[PDB]
Amino acid sequence: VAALVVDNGSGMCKAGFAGDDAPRAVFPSIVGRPRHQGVMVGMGQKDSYVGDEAQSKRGILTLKYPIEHGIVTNWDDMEKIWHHTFYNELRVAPEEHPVLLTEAPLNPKANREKMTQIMFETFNTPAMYVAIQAVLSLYASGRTTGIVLDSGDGVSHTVPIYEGYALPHAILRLDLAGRDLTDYLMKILTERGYSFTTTEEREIVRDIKEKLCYVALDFEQEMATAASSSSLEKSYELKDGQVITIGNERFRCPEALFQPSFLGMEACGIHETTYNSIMKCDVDIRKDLYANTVLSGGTTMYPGIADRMQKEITALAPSTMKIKIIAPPERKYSVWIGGSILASLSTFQQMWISKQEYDESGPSIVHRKCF
Amino acid sequence: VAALVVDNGSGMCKAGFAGDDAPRAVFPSIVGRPRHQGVMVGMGQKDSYVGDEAQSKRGILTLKYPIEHGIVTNWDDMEKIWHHTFYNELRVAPEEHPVLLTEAPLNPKANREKMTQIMFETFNTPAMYVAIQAVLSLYASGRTTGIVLDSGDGVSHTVPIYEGYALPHAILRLDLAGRDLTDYLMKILTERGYSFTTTAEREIVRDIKEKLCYVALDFEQEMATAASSSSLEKSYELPDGQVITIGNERFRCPEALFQPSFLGMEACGIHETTYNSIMKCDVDIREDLYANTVLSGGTTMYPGIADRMQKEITALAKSTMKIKIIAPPERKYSVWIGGSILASLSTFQQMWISKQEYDESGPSIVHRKCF
Amino acid sequence: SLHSALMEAIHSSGGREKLRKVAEQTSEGRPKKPSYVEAESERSALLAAIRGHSGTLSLRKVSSLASEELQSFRNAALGAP
Numbered sequence: 076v077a078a079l080v081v082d083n084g085s086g087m088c089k090a091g092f093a094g095d096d097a098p099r100a101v102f103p104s105i106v107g108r109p110r111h112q113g114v115m116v117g118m119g120q121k122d123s124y125v126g127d128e129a130q131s132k133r134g135i136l137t138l139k140y141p142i143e144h145g146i147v148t149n150w151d152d153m154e155k156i157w158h159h160t161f162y163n164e165l166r167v168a169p170e171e172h173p174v175l176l177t178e179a180p181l182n183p184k185a186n187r188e189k190m191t192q193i194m195f196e197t198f199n200t201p202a203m204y205v206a207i208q209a210v211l212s213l214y215a216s217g218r219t220t221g222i223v224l225d226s227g228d229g230v231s232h233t234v235p236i237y238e239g240y241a242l243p244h245a246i247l248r249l250d251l252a253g254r255d256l257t258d259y260l261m262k263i264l265t266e267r268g269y270s271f272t273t274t275e276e277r278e279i280v281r282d283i284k285e286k287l288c289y290v291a292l293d294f295e296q297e298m299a300t301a302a303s304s305s306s307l308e309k310s311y312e313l314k315d316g317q318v319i320t321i322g323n324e325r326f327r328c329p330e331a332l333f334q335p336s337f338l339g340m341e342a343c344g345i346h347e348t349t350y351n352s353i354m355k356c357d358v359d360i361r362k363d364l365y366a367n368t369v370l371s372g373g374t375t376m377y378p379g380i381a382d383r384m385q386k387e388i389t390a391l392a393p394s395t396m397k398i399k400i401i402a403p404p405e406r407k408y409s410v411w412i413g414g415s416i417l418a419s420l421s422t423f424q425q426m427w428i429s430k431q432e433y434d435e436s437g438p439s440i441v442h443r444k445c446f
Numbered sequence: 447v448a449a450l451v452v453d454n455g456s457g458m459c460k461a462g463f464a465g466d467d468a469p470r471a472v473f474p475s476i477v478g479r480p481r482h483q484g485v486m487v488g489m490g491q492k493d494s495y496v497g498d499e500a501q502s503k504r505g506i507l508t509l510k511y512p513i514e515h516g517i518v519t520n521w522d523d524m525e526k527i528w529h530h531t532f533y534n535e536l537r538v539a540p541e542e543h544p545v546l547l548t549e550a551p552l553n554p555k556a557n558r559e560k561m562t563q564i565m566f567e568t569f570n571t572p573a574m575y576v577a578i579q580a581v582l583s584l585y586a587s588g589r590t591t592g593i594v595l596d597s598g599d600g601v602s603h604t605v606p607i608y609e610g611y612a613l614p615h616a617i618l619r620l621d622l623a624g625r626d627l628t629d630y631l632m633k634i635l636t637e638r639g640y641s642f643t644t645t646a647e648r649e650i651v652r653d654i655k656e657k658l659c660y661v662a663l664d665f666e667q668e669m670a671t672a673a674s675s676s677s678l679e680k681s682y683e684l685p686d687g688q689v690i691t692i693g694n695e696r697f698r699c700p701e702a703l704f705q706p707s708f709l710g711m712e713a714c715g716i717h718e719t720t721y722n723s724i725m726k727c728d729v730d731i732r733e734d735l736y737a738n739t740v741l742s743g744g745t746t747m748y749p750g751i752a753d754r755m756q757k758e759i760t761a762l763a764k765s766t767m768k769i770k771i772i773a774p775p776e777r778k779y780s781v782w783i784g785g786s787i788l789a790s791l792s793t794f795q796q797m798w799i800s801k802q803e804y805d806e807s808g809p810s811i812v813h814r815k816c817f
Numbered sequence: 818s819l820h821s822a823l824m825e826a827i828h829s830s831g832g833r834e835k836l837r838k839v840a841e842q843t844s845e846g847r848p849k850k851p852s853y854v855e856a857e858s859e860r861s862a863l864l865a866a867i868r869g870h871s872g873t874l875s876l877r878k879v880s881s882l883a884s885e886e887l888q889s890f891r892n893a894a895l896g897a898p
C-alpha cells in the first residue's frame with residue numbers, strides 16, 4: 076500500500092515514504108570501492124560503501140559520483156545507491172512497494188529506459204513511475220502550470236511547465252549552482268586573509284555559506300554599507316576555535332547567482348535565465364509563468380532571494396505584469412514533497428507503470444507514461 | 447493573501463493593506479456611548495458608535511478615548527475600535543489576514559500581551575506582529591539605524607534605534623505635542639483679542655495651526671520683524687466669514703516645541719531632548735545618529751522645523767559632527783507607510799506570530815519576537 | 818478524464834504539506850519566504866531589504882481621502898482629535 080519516493084540529486088539522495096512530509100533518508104550520492112582489485116586487509120565482504128561511510132573510508136577507497144550534473148553517468152554505481160536506499164536506509168522490500176523516481180530536465184531517452192529496466196528487472200518493483208524533479212516542485216505548491224527555477228549542487232534549470240508537462244524547448248540549463256559558490260566563497264575569504272583549500276576546509280566554507288550568506292535587495296548599496304561600518308560583520312565559530320570574521324562576503328557570495336561574471340563566467344544570471352525561458356514560451360501562456368515563478372533546491376535558500384528575484388524580473392518584464400515569486404520555506408525538499416503528494420493521491424493510483432505493463436511493453440513504455 | 451497594517455494613534459487611527467502607498471481608513475480614536483436621558487421608555491438606537499459617526503452624533507453621546515498618550519487605557523473600548531476597523535472600515539475578515547499592529551515606545555509588557563491575546567482569541571487572526579511606531583518611521587525612510595523624533599497628539603518621543611532594535615535606555619519621552627500646541631494658540635489668540643474655548647471653536651484653531659503656523663529660524667529676529675511690520679500676518683476666514691488676522695502667533699505657537707516654558711513647563715525642548723538621547727548612547731553609534739535624525743508624526747509637519755532642528759542641534763553638538771535632519775514630506779504617515787513596507791517584504795514573512803505559536807506559548811510569546 | 822482529475826487533485830485536494838509527521842500546518846504573508854534554519858542570515862536579509870526597497874514610489878497607488886494629501890506632498894484638512 077505505501078509508495079516509495081526517491082529523489083536522486085547530484086549532491087544528496089533524498090528518500091522516504093509517500094504521505095510523509097519529509098524524507099526519512101538523506102545521504103550523499105557517493106559510491107566507494109576499494110582501490111586495488113583483489114587484495115585487502117579491507118573488511119568482511121563489502122566490495123562497496125555508500126554515503127557517509129564511503130566518505131569516512133575515503134582513504135581506502137576510490138570514490139565515484141554516479142549522478143553528475145543531474146544525469147546518471149554509471150548505472151552500476153547508481154544501482155549501488157538504490158540498493159543502499161531500500162535496504163540500509165528505509166529498510167523495506169523493493170518488491171513490496173511501488174516506487175516513484177525523479178529525473179533532471181532534458182534527461183536522454185536512453186537513461187529513462189535504463190531507470191525503468193533496473194527498477195523492474197533488478198529490484199522487482201510491483202509498480203513504478205518517473206517524474207521530472209522541477210515538475211514535482213510545482214506540484215508541491217499546489218500548481219500545475221508555472222516556471223520553476225531548480226538549483227542544487229551541480230546544476231540549475233529554469234523549467235516552464237504548462238498543465239502538468241514540462242516544455243522542453245524553453246528549458247534553459249545554467250551551468251552554475253551550489254558548488255560554484257562554495258568554491259567562490261573560498262576564493263573571497265582567502266582574499267580577505269584566511270585560507271580554505273583542502274576538501275575538509277571546503278566542508279567548513281559550505282557550512283558558513285548555508286548559515287551566514289544572504290541576498291541583498293540592493294547589492295551596490297549593501298557594498299557601500301559594509302565598507303563604511305562593521306555592522307554587517309559576523310564572526311564564525313570554527314571547530315578548532317579559530318574565530319573567523321566575515322564581512323561583505325556574506326552577500327557577495329549569493330550575488331554570483333545574479334552576476335556570474337564574479338565567477339569568470341560569461342553567462343546570464345538566474346533572473347535573466349528565468350526571463351529568457353518565459354520568453355521562449357508562447358505569448359499566450361507567459362502571463363501564467365510570470366504569476367507563478369517557483370523557487371526550489373538548496374541553492375535558492377538564501378534569505379532575500381525572492382524579493383530580489385521579484386525586482387530583477389520586473390525590471391525585465393512589461394509594465395503592470397503580475398510577477399509572483401513563490402519561495403516556500405521548505406523549498407530544499409520541494410521536489411521530494413511534491414513526489415510524496417503525487418504518489419499518495421488516489422487519482423494517481425492508475426497512473427503507475429505496473430509490472431504487468433512492463434512485461435509486455437519493456438523499458439520503452441516509460442515514454443508513453445510521460446511526455 | 448494581503449496583510450493588514452493598523453497604526454493606533456492617540457488621536458487618529460490609520461488602517462490599510464501591506465503594499466499600498468498609503469492607508470485606506472483614517473478616523474478618530476473615539477468611542478461614543480449614548481448618555482442617559484433619565485426616561486421611562488428608553489429604546490431606540492445602538493449601544494456604541496465608533497469614529498466618524500461617533501463624532502457627528504457627539505451631542506447625544508459621551509465620548510471616550512481608549513488610547514491615551516499612545517498607551518491603551520481601556521481594553522473594552524479598544525476592542526470596539528479594532529472591530530470597527532476590520533469590519534466597517536476595511537470590510538475584511540480578521541481570521542483571513544495577518545495583522546501588523548503598532549505600539550508606543552516603552553509600552554508596558556502587560557499591555558503587549560493583552561494586544562496579542564485579543565488578536566488570536568477575539569479576532570481569530572492567522573498571524574500578527576507588534577512594532578514600535580518610531581522604528582517603522584525610520585524604516586519608512588529606508589534606514590535601520592538612526593534616531594527619530596516622533597511627535598503626535600499627546601506625546602513626543604526620541605527613539606535611538608540600532609539595526610532594527612530600539613534602545614530603551616536612551617529613549618526619552620516629552621510630554622508636549624500637538625494638542626498642547628493647539629491649546630497654546632487658543633490662549634495666545636484670546637489675549638490678542640479673539641475668543642476660542644467652545645469645543646467647536648477648538649477645531650477651528652486646530653485648523654489654523656495646521657495651515658498657517660510655522661517655525662522661525664530665528665525666533666527673536668522673527669518677533670522683531672513681526673513688531674515692525676505686518677508682512678508676516680495672514681488672514682483666516684471662518685465659516686461665517688469673520689476674517690481673523692493672525693501675526694506672530696504663527697511662529698510663537700510652534701516655538702513651544704523649542705521653549706516649553708511658553709507653556710509653563712520645566713521641560714527641555716525637542717532639539718535638546720533629541721541631543722540627550724544621542725548622549726545616552728555609546729560613542730561608536732553617535733555619528734550615525736547625528737547624520738540620521740528622522741522626523742515623524744503630525745506635529746513635525748510645520749514648515750521650517752527641520753532647518754531649525756539642524757541649527758539647534760549643530761549648536762548643542764560637538765563641532766565637526768555631521769548633522770543631518772531628514773524630514774520626508776509624507777512624514778505624517780511614516781509610521782503606517784513603514785509598517786506597510788515591512789509587512790509586504792518577503793524577508794519578513796517568517797517573522798509573524800502564527801496561531802499555532804500562540805496556542806503553545808500563550809500571550810507572552812510576543813516578548814520573544816523583538817529581543 | 819484521467820489527467821484532468823489529477824490536475825484538479827493537485828490544486829484542490831490537500832496539495833499542501835498537511836501530509837504527516839511534524840510539519841508546518843499553517844503559514845501566511847503578503848509575499849513568500851526566502852529563508853533557512855539560520856535566523857541570523859534572515860535578519861541580515863530583512864534589514865538589507867528595508868535599506869534597499871524604493872520609496873513610497875515603489876508602492877501600490879491608492880485613492881484614499883487622506884492619502885490624497887500625501888501624493889500632493891503638503892495639503893491638510895482635519896488632522897487629529
Ligand SMILES: Nc1ncnc2c1ncn2[C@@H]1O[C@H](COP(=O)(O)OP(=O)(O)NP(=O)(O)O)[C@@H](O)[C@H]1O
Nearest residue numbers: 084085086087227228229230253285373374376853
Ligand atoms: N541555506 C543554504 N544556503 C545556501 N546554499 C545551501 C543552503 N542549504 C543547502 N545549500 C546548498 O545546496 C546545494 C545542494 O542542493 P540540493 O538541491 O539539495 O542538492 P541535489 O539535488 O542533491 N544536487 P543537484 O543534482 O545539483 O540538484 C549544495 O551546494 C549546498 O551547499
Ligand SMILES: Nc1ncnc2c1ncn2[C@@H]1O[C@H](COP(=O)(O)OP(=O)(O)NP(=O)(O)O)[C@@H](O)[C@H]1O
Nearest residue numbers: 455456457458598599600624656744745747896897
Ligand atoms: N500640517 C500640520 N501642521 C501642524 N500640526 C499638524 C499637521 N497635521 C497634523 N497635525 C497635528 O498632529 C497631531 C496628531 O498627529 P498624529 O501624528 O496623527 O498623532 P496620532 O498618531 O494620531 N496620536 P499619537 O499616538 O499620540 O501620536 C494633532 O494635534 C494635529 O493637530
Ligand SMILES: [Mg+2]
Nearest residue numbers: 084208227410
Ligand atoms: Mg535536486
Ligand SMILES: [Mg+2]
Nearest residue numbers: 455598599743
Ligand atoms: Mg503617532
